[PDB]
Amino acid sequence: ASETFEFQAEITQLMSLIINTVYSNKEIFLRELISNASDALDKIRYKSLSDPKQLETEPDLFIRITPKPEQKVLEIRDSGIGMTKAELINNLGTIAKSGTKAFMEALSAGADVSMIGQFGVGFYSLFLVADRVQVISKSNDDEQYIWESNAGGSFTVTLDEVNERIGRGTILRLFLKDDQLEYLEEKRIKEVIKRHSEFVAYPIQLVVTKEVE
Numbered sequence: 001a002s003e004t005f006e007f008q009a010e011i012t013q014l015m016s017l018i019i020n021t022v023y024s025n026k027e028i029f030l031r032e033l034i035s036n037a038s039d040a041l042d043k044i045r046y047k048s049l050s051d052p053k054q055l056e057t058e059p060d061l062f063i064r065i066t067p068k069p070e071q072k073v074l075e076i077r078d079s080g081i082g083m084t085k086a087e088l089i090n091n092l093g094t095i096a097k098s099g100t101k102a103f104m105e106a107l108s109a110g111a112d113v114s115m116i117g118q119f120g121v122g123f124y125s126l127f128l129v130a131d132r133v134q135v136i137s138k139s140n141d142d143e144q145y146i147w148e149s150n151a152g153g154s155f156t157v158t159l160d161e162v163n164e165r166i167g168r169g170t171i172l173r174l175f176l177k178d179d180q181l182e183y184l185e186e187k188r189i190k191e192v193i194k195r196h197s198e199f200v201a202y203p204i205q206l207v208v209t210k211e212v213e
């Protein structure tokens, strides 16, 4: 059984705006997700300073990107702090965010969509290239859960009994729009990373599937 929740009014507005925008530099979405991953990694790392055992659930700190072409899916994973069920509901939708309205007004004035991250709502830039997203997360303090949204007014949270076990961390599973399948390509992904995420303190791994020769 999955519980359904409504997004705070302004967040629904932002998503509708983003998923329908004409913007030409949509690649910045990956920069934002990598940045968020790094911040979650910083949090578990900082937390481990006074409680090292917090790391035992997943000793390695990394960001991993996995293209799943057959499903037109792009996964961005990190072994950061992760989110409990309550945090998913809180952080991803029900609580108002300081910059949602301000960012939208900035866009109306001509601001570059690339500024989204500075308004603290970069997560939603994922809708530039995807029309559906599943956030799979495992915090040391809770079971693994699935938060899902299609840019509509509500989202779902479900106990995870269908995905690979995450030691600790979060997986953003993006279901790419048909005209944005280029982000499934190793070449494209690498250039976006080098260009926007040169200064990341964690290893960024890319999972590539090749047919044997």
Ligand SMILES: COC(=O)c1c(O)cc(O)c(Cl)c1CCC(=O)Nc1cc(O)c(OC)cc1O
Binding pocket: 033, 036, 037, 040, 041, 078, 080, 081, 082, 083, 090, 091, 092, 123, 169, 170, 172
């Ligand atoms: C802890 O953040 C995450 O686990 C995480 C991640 O690993 C990858 C991501 O792409 C995203 Cl979006 C996240 C969630 C980031 C987030 O929204 N954190 C957050 C939000 C809040 O509103 C808040 O105040 C209650 C605190 C947060 O940490």
